[PDB]
Ligand binder design. Structure first.
Ligand SMILES: *[C@@H]1O[C@H](CO[C@@H]2O[C@@H](C)[C@@H](O)[C@@H](O)[C@@H]2O)[C@@H](O[C@@H]2O[C@H](CO)[C@@H](O)[C@H](O)[C@H]2NC(C)=O)[C@H](O)[C@H]1NC(C)=O
Lengths: 129, 195
């Protein structure tokens, strides 16, 4: 039910919720990493009234890690060894981190970190002061 | 000895997707910067490698596959996709290692009244395997009646023309696509970056 609901590739995010400022939260994304082991995995977020923005990216070998400057030192992207799940560990959360967070699968782009092939449905993260 | 990329990307004519062209690239130095510094491409993404690292890598075999499809079909040149291009014309592997590069070719491949030289396969009894090519022209049996090479009701010629016209919207315009595949096979390397 991610942006293409009928495709073979499906991405499902979970773990969103309400968190106090300064707290931690880890998002999960079930992904077909064993099959599509060469594709880039990434996290995006979209807050109300703003455009979707890049957050983090990684390959299924836990290398080629990219971060947006706004989250460096606070967020960590990772994968599990069986290539079944992508994670976004979030630390020292701020109100500006409130958004719907999207998981994505695609290729490594030239003009942007990931040129996306498939989108998830999104999970809502709300940070309160 | 620079690799013949200008041949692949700047060729006057491109192949139909059903008869997609493969050019082997070997025994040469590959300056990928003439590509990854250019700004003429609408699609430029790589799988299993990063576009900025290609100049630092060595590969056993490099293949350049090229063809023309519609703009709104470039999405099908990606791992796991379906549709007539991915199913019946050109199929990327699920664990593809390489890059997909595309650019708008309306100025070259569209014609008033329609350019009918570019074809695609519309019907097939099964999906293509990765990197498979099908150039057959057998009549497709869509119903219970055997065709026996006779075209007619429920008996289709399997190829169809794009008919590119210059006034089309961007999604309907022709796009030239080059797929670079990078192969490692436990033998010495033939293609390396300018190091
Ligand atoms: C594909 O060709 C472009 C266009 O180059 C033009 O046509 C050539 C046949 C030749 O006559 C060039 O002098 C023309 O400019 C190439 O893009 C050029 O690349 C050079 C560096 O090699 C650069 O200095 C020019 O500014 C570029 N010109 C344009 C219009 O972008 C391109 O490099 C060729 N592709 C490959 C893979 O070789």
């Amino acid at each position: 039910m991610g942006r293409d609901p009928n495709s073979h590739v499906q991405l499902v995010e979970s773990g969103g919720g309400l968190v106090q400022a300064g707290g931690s939260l880890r998002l999960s994304c079930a992904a077909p990493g064993r099959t599509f082991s060469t594709s880039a995995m990434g996290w995006f977020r979209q807050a109300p009234g703003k455009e979707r923005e890049f957050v983090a990216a990684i390959d299924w070998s836990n290398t080629n890690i990219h971060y947006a400057d706004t989250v460096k030192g606070r967020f960590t992207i990772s994968t599990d060894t069986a290539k079944n799940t992508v994670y976004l560990q979030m630390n020292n959360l701020k109100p500006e981190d409130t958004a719907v967070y999207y998981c994505a699968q695609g290729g490594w782009g030239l003009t942007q970190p990931i040129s996306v092939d498939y989108w998830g449905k999104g999970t809502q993260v709300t940070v309160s002061s | 000895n620079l690799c013949p990329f200008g041949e692949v990307f700047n060729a006057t004519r491109f192949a139909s997707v059903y008869a997609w062209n493969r050019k082997r690239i070997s025994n040469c130095v590959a300056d990928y910067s003439v590509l990854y510094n250019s700004a003429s491409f609408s699609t430029f993404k790589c799988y299993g490698v990063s576009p900025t690292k290609l100049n630092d890598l060595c590969f056993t075999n490099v293949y350049a596959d090229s063809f023309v499809i519609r703009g709104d079909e470039v999405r099908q040149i990606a791992p796991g996709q379906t549709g007539k291009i991915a199913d019946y014309n050109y199929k990327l592997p699920d664990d593809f290692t390489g890059c997909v590069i595309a650019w708008n070719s309306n100025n070259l491949d569209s014609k008033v009244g329609g350019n009918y030289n570019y074809l695609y396969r519309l019907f097939r009894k099964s999906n293509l395997k990765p990197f498979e090519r099908d150039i057959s022209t057998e009549i497709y049996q869509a119903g219970s009646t055997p065709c026996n090479g006779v075209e007619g009701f429920n008996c289709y010629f399997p190829l169809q023309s794009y008919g590119f016209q210059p006034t089309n919207g961007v999604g309907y315009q022709p796009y030239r696509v080059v797929v670079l595949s990078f192969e490692l096979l436990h033998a010495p390397a033939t293609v390396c970056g300018p190091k």
